[model samples]
Structures are given as structure tokens and as C-alpha cells.
Target: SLNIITVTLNMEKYNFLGISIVGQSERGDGGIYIGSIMKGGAVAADGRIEPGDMLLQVNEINFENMSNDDAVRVLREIVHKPGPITLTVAKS
Candidate 1:
């Protein structure tokens, strides 16, 4: 099984952080970076998440040795089911 997290966004709220996205694995020494507030999304509405934030864990499951594909799969699963998710995160 995989961990999942969800955040709701509203058009009424606005912030400079834009949208939040979990960083994926890179092909170099850069290592895997997730949980970055990219541009244009719910983060602006909630103002709880931000870009450059390191992904610590999701739904209480820590992604220490997981690959980007694995993380993506978790998200896909949630999308397929349609429900609420809780995310545990840490800022960089």
C-alpha cells in the first residue's frame, strides 16, 4: 500500500506560493526532492504549503527509499478512488 495526502484550494484565497507539488526523483546527485509549491494551485488558497519544501512523509508513511514513480502511484490511486487524504510535510 502507499500513503496519500490531500489539500483543498479555493479561488477566494490567494498567496504568492502558488500551487504545491511534491518533488520527484532526479537523474543525478540532486537526489529525490518532493513537496515543492510550484505555481498555480490550492496552496495559494490554504497558505499552509510552500515551494522548495522537502517531502517528509505522506499519510504518516515516510518516503525514505521510495522512487518518484512510487510516489506518483500513490497519488494516482487516490485520484482513482476519490476521497479525502491527509499529508504530513516539512519545509526546506
Candidate 2:
């Protein structure tokens, strides 16, 4: 059995999710971790994601295998899409 916390966020312009991320090494095993969430940002508004939370997926796309730069690109892609972003996060 696995215990994970998933949150769905709708990104609005200027929101930026209010979070900073640091990507982990390894593929499909390591994930990007949330460093901080800016006050009054999207995540702040949602009040779900927390510091030290690891983001495993975005919109169903796995982030574990990609490099930090690549993962950032993927996140940018997801942000460009016109829909809610699904994030699979686990607390550390």
C-alpha cells in the first residue's frame, strides 16, 4: 500500500503557484520537491501544497525520470495548457 497526497490546482495568470521547486535525480523514483510557496499565490490561495512536499506528477506526466531542466520545461508545458493541473505530491 502507498500513501500519497494529490492536489489539483487551477493556475491563473500571475499566480505562479507561489512555489519554488528543486528537481531530484533518478527516473520515475525521485521527484521534484517544493521549496516554498509565496504568500498570496495560487497554492497559497488553495492552501494545500506545503514546503518539503515532493511533486511526483503533473497532469499525469511523471517527473521522476526527467532532469531538473526538463522537468521545468514539462511544468511550463502543463502551465500553457488551458486546464486544471493535477499534481501528485507526497510529504517528506
Compare the candidates by TM-score and give the number of the best one. 2
Reference-based TM-score of each model = 0.52, 0.78
Go through the candidates in order and give the clash count of each: 5, 3
Error of 1 at 58 (Å): 2.0
RMSD of each: 7.6, 2.6
Worst 10 residues of 1 by lDDT: 10-19
Off by over 4 Å in 2: 1-3, 12-15, 27-30
Q: State the lDDT at 8 in candidate 2.
A: 75
Residue 49 lDDT (model 2): 80
Evaluated at residue 86, the lDDT of candidate 1 is 48
lDDT of each: 0.48, 0.75
For residue 91, give model 1's deviation from the true position in Å: 0.7
lDDT of 2 by residue, 2-56 (tens): 5587787777544466678895754456668888888876678877788888877
lDDT of 1: 0.48
